[PDB]
Amino acid sequence: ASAPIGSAISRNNWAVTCDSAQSGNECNKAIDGNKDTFWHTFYGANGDPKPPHTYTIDMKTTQNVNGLSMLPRQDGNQNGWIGRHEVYLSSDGTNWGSPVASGSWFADSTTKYSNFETRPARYVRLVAITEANGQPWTSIAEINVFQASSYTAPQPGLGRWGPTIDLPIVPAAAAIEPTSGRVLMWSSYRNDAFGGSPGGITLTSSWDPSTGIVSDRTVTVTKHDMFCPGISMDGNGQIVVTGGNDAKKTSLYDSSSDSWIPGPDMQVARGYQSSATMSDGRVFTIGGSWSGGVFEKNGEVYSPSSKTWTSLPNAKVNPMLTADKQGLYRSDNHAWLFGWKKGSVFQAGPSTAMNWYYTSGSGDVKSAGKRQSNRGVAPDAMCGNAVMYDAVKGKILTFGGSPDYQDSDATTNAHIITLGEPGTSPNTVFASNGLYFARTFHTSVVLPDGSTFITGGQRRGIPFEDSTPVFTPEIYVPEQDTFYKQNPNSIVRVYHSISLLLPDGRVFNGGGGLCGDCTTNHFDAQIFTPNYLYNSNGNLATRPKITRTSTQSVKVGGRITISTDSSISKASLIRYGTATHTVNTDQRRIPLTLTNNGGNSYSFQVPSDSGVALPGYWMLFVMNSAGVPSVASTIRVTQ
Numbered sequence: 324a325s326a327p328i329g330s331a332i333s334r335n336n337w338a339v340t341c342d343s344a345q346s347g348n349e350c351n352k353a354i355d356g357n358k359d360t361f362w363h364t365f366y367g368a369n370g371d372p373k374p375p376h377t378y379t380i381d382m383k384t385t386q387n388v389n390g391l392s393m394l395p396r397q398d399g400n401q402n403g404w405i406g407r408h409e410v411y412l413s414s415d416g417t418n419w420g421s422p423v424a425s426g427s428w429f430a431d432s433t434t435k436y437s438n439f440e441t442r443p444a445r446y447v448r449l450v451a452i453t454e455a456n457g458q459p460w461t462s463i464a465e466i467n468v469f470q471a472s473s474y475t476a477p478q479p480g481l482g483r484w485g486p487t488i489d490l491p492i493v494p495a496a497a498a499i500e501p502t503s504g505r506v507l508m509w510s511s512y513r514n515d516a517f518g519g520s521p522g523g524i525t526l527t528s529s530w531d532p533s534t535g536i537v538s539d540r541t542v543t544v545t546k547h548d549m550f551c552p553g554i555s556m557d558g559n560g561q562i563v564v565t566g567g568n569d570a571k572k573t574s575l576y577d578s579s580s581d582s583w584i585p586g587p588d589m590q591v592a593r594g595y596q597s598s599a600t601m602s603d604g605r606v607f608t609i610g611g612s613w614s615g616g617v618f619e620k621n622g623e624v625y626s627p628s629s630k631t632w633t634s635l636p637n638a639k640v641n642p643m644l645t646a647d648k649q650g651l652y653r654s655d656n657h658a659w660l661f662g663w664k665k666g667s668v669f670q671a672g673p674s675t676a677m678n679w680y681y682t683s684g685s686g687d688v689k690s691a692g693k694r695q696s697n698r699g700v701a702p703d704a705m706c707g708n709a710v711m712y713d714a715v716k717g718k719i720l721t722f723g724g725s726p727d728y729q730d731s732d733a734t735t736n737a738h739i740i741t742l743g744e745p746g747t748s749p750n751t752v753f754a755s756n757g758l759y760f761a762r763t764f765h766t767s768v769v770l771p772d773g774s775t776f777i778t779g780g781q782r783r784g785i786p787f788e789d790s791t792p793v794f795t796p797e798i799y800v801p802e803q804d805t806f807y808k809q810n811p812n813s814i815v816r817v818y819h820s821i822s823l824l825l826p827d828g829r830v831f832n833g834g835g836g837l838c839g840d841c842t843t844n845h846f847d848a849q850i851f852t853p854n855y856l857y858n859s860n861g862n863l864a865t866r867p868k869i870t871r872t873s874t875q876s877v878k879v880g881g882r883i884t885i886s887t888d889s890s891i892s893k894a895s896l897i898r899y900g901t902a903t904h905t906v907n908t909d910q911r912r913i914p915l916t917l918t919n920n921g922g923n924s925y926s927f928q929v930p931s932d933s934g935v936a937l938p939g940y941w942m943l944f945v946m947n948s949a950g951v952p953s954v955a956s957t958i959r960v961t962q
């Protein structure tokens with residue numbers, strides 16, 4: 324199931340308007356309170372005009388609208404299920420602006436929702452752009468519009484949430500497809516559940532930021548239900564998805580061809596493990612006792628060149644185990660892994676003990692000391708997040724999480740870990756005064772300016788329950804060692820939520836739930852627009868533009884020359900992300916040192932160390948004096 328975020332507006336005074344309506348199926352049948360009567364557009368007798376079909380509501384009075392719901396016809400007939408759609412709001416009925424929600428609803432008879440940030444409106448319009456099975460018609464049994472108990476204008480300077488992207492699935496895992504700019508998402512064998520899977524299948528969905536189209540694809544070629552996997556972008560530009568519901572499987576997603584290829588089985592059955600791309604483009608993984616048994620699950624390594632997983636039994640998982648009450652089932656999950664120099668992987672937590680993992684020979688592990696500060700030893704932080712916001716300087720910001728996976732109070736603990744050479748114990752200090760809000764199951768991304776955006780989570784980890792939710796996201800600004808609250812959102816994003824940085828410099832935050840009949844499934848995402856995209860008026864800032872790039876593919880240590888339409892003060896490369904279960908081992912940021920060639924021509928060198936400049940796809944952002952980022956130019960970094 325799912326749920327509206329607001330409460331149903333009284334429909335007694337509503338006037339409704341439909342592009343067409345069969346007699347017996349009038350526009351007002353969608354607002355009569357009867358699940359057995361439905362509006363239906365013209366068919367047969369009147370011909371079959373194709374979509375778009377439009378449902379427009381005059382609520383007569385201004386309401387603080389934060390959603391709609393759409394109950395499909397309930398007669399066992401599929402005709403007119405709304406697929407692609409947009410929701411518009413209006414104060415006058417004439418000027419509709421941009422959609423507050425858009426995307427695609429799953430093809431079934433269940434109630435669908437559009438949950439979105441509160442916006443005072445008197446008119447609400449639902450456009451059915453397509454029918455879920457490609458037929459001419461639109462039918463709605465019941466349409467409802469929801470209100471918050473109040474409206475507060477967003478605070479100026481603190482970013483903006485919206486629009487909502489409606490989805491056919493709960494995007495519990497997601498990646499950017501860097502060659503297309505699209506957002507790839509997946510659930511499990513079902514759009515809303517992982518429990519009861521027979522294995523062998525994954526439902527996926529994509530969102531295209533340019534076209535606004537949400538599509539879907541069922542993946543069976545890899546014989547893999549990819550719920551709760553490791554995810555890494557390898558040096559061959561392929562997303563390596565490991566284990567999970569099918570605990571030994573590897574699936575490979577190729578962005579170029581937009582296709583999935585079977586990968587080799589891992590040596591060890593795993594779920595809830597983290598995997599990390601290494602300096603040589605290979606992928607390391609360790610832990611994961613969520614599936615395939617509970618026992619010591621030591622490291623192993625994937626080569627995209629030989630297409631093999633090789634066990635690294637001496638890369639011991641024991642040192643990175645938390646003291647989780649549930650034991651090994653949880654204690655080896657969601658390692659905060661980062662590919663580093665010379666085939667090493669740093670494990671920053673969640674366990675108090677941090678560790679270096681080595682991938683030469685049959686593997687090794689070396690204690691890197693305890694995550695700590697003058698405030699004390701950091702406790703275990705399961706589902707805390709870790710973000711490498713300056714790879715050049717080895718800077719990792721870690722935050723939140725709880726000592727146990729579940730039934731455990733989250734904390735505001737946050738640290739800055741500074742990586743030096745593998746085998747040395749990094750410096751660790753407390754980050755500012757910690758998070759504003761204790762949270763676990765939150766998600767986070769590094770932004771073009773090096774700040775880290777932190778969103779969602781709850782104070783008390785209760786998977787599948789939307790309790791103690793944190794609605795106010797925070798941004799850590801490293802230069803100021805300060806966290807800033809941003810404008811809050813209205814949709815709970817807890818267990819099974821994701822966040823990714825978009826090429827346009829916005830954040831895509833979605834998912835949560837995946838519990839079948841539970842009401843806490845969120846079949847959506849929302850866009851957060853950072854303040855850096857807004858000028859002092861609160862309008863969208865003029866963005867500097869990259870008018871030419873010397874190349875789209877560079878070796879580590881290589882130079883790229885660009886031209887811009889205006890002078891730029893700062894530049895960054897941000898490695899494209901992947902996300903599930905709080906884990907994102909793919910994103911990282913490199914601050915670029917720019918050579919001003921004059922004439923708005925600039926050059927920079929990609930770091931020569933591939934442990935820093937992890938091979939794969941990266942976003943180049945350039946920022947003007949005003950600190951407004953360009954949209955990203957995609958750069959492939961190779962060895």
Ligand SMILES: [Ca+2]
Nearest residue numbers: 352357360464
């Ligand atoms: Ca009805």
